[PDB]
Design a protein around this motif. Structure first.
Motif, mmCIF file in Angstrom:
data_model
loop_
_atom_site.group_PDB
_atom_site.id
_atom_site.type_symbol
_atom_site.label_atom_id
_atom_site.label_comp_id
_atom_site.label_asym_id
_atom_site.label_seq_id
_atom_site.Cartn_x
_atom_site.Cartn_y
_atom_site.Cartn_z
ATOM 1 N N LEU A 84 0.854 -1.283 0.546
ATOM 2 C CA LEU A 84 0.029 -0.123 -0.009
ATOM 3 C C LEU A 84 1.260 1.616 0.050
ATOM 4 N N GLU A 85 2.211 1.135 0.606
ATOM 5 C CA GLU A 85 3.042 2.735 0.689
ATOM 6 C C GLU A 85 3.485 2.321 -0.418
ATOM 7 N N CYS A 86 4.214 1.309 -0.899
ATOM 8 C CA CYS A 86 5.296 0.434 -2.109
ATOM 9 C C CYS A 86 4.957 1.458 -3.389
ATOM 10 N N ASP A 105 8.744 -7.372 -2.288
ATOM 11 C CA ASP A 105 10.251 -7.177 -2.686
ATOM 12 C C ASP A 105 11.450 -6.213 -1.319
ATOM 13 N N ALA A 106 9.857 -5.136 -0.931
ATOM 14 C CA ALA A 106 10.190 -4.392 0.551
ATOM 15 C C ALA A 106 10.705 -5.824 1.306
ATOM 16 N N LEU A 134 14.115 1.420 2.990
ATOM 17 C CA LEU A 134 14.581 2.509 3.874
ATOM 18 C C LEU A 134 14.169 3.773 4.402
ATOM 19 N N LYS A 135 13.501 4.362 4.159
ATOM 20 C CA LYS A 135 12.731 5.046 4.693
ATOM 21 C C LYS A 135 12.344 4.761 6.822
ATOM 22 N N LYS A 136 11.225 3.789 5.977
ATOM 23 C CA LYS A 136 10.899 3.092 7.480
ATOM 24 C C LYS A 136 12.062 2.409 7.910
ATOM 25 N N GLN A 137 13.718 2.614 7.789
ATOM 26 C CA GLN A 137 14.687 2.017 8.524
ATOM 27 C C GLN A 137 15.093 3.778 9.619
ATOM 28 N N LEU A 157 7.510 10.463 0.591
ATOM 29 C CA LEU A 157 7.973 9.081 1.656
ATOM 30 C C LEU A 157 9.121 10.258 2.324
ATOM 31 N N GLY A 158 9.395 11.594 1.316
ATOM 32 C CA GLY A 158 10.508 12.542 2.461
ATOM 33 C C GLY A 158 12.155 11.909 1.557
#
Ligand SMILES: O=C(O)[C@@H]1C=C(O)[C@@H](O)[C@H](O)C1
Length: 255
Positions: A84-86, A105-106, A134-137, A157-158
């Motif tokens: 949903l975020e990808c 993939d994520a 990667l933003k998630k991390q 995503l920033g």
């Protein structure tokens, strides 16, 4: 018992190792699955509709590769999980007679990785999932491309988005594009100061990776990410009955 069809949509598709590792799992786990599974490479025309072909072929599940991952996202009846975020879908399952899309993939990428910031080259489906992960991390993420396609997605995503190669140091330099993907000397300074050159391609040794290898930069190809994401898709292909770690070990042995 009964026969269930699966595959991988892609153009090109000849070199894909998904049928090899998925067929191994369908054979190995057939009594738990309680069906006969078979996984085909399916070359899709560029002009073609992923949903229509999925249905016409009567598949129960599929994977999606270049250049169809974003399109898969747009055409699913339903998107679930991190997909949903990808903004991208690499995994298709038929659920309650509805085409449902997921992204493996994520997490597959996360699992493949043994870093403060990253530079992603590319803007397609794979690049989109990796930037999300990667933003998630909590990493800083820059994305570099020639055009401005995908701006909105990465900016929301920033990520820092660029068309000129930023004069900066990055720990991870990731080739998620579809020749070298940059000016040789630009790529060279990135490697000189980088910690890992990571290329999503597998099964052959790309210019990007040869150059890193040449300069003694630590490098990693796409094989591990291939197997993890495949393992994860398999889990979805089994109705969540075979856990991805089980799938993963079988898939690693065959390769
Ligand atoms: O078989 C391949 O080469 C595919 C490679 C990817 O990028 C995955 O997302 C697909 O699910 C499988």
């Amino acid at each position: 018992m009964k026969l269930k069809s699966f595959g991988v949509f892609g153009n090109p598709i000849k070199h894909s190792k998904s049928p090899l590792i998925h067929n191994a799992c369908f054979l190995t786990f057939q009594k738990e699955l309680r069906f006969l599974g078979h996984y085909h490479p399916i070359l899709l025309p560029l002009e073609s509709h992923i949903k229509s072909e999925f249905l016409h072929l009567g598949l129960s599940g599929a994977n999606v590769t270049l250049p169809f991952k974003e399109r898969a996202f747009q055409v699913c009846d339903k998107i679930k999980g991190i997909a949903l975020e990808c903004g991208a879908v690499n995994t298709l399952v038929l659920e309650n007679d509805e085409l449902v899309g997921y992204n493996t993939d994520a997490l597959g990428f996360y699992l493949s990785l043994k870093y403060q910031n990253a530079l992603i080259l590319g803007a397609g489906g794979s690049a989109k999932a990796l930037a999300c992960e990667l933003k998630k991390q909590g990493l800083q993420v820059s994305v570099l491309n020639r055009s401005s396609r995908g701006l909105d997605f990465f900016q929301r995503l920033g990520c820092d988005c660029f068309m000129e190669p930023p004069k900066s140091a990055f720990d991870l330099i990731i080739n998620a594009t579809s020749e070298l993907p940059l000016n040789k000397e630009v790529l060279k300074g990135y490697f000189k100061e980088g910690k890992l050159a990571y290329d999503l391609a597998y099964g052959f040794l790309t210019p990007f990776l040869s150059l890193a290898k040449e300069l003694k930069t630590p490098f990693q190809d796409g094989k591990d990410m291939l197997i993890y994401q495949a393992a994860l898709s398999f889990e979805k292909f089994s109705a969540s009955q075979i856990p991805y770690s089980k799938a993963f070990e079988v898939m690693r042995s065959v390769f």
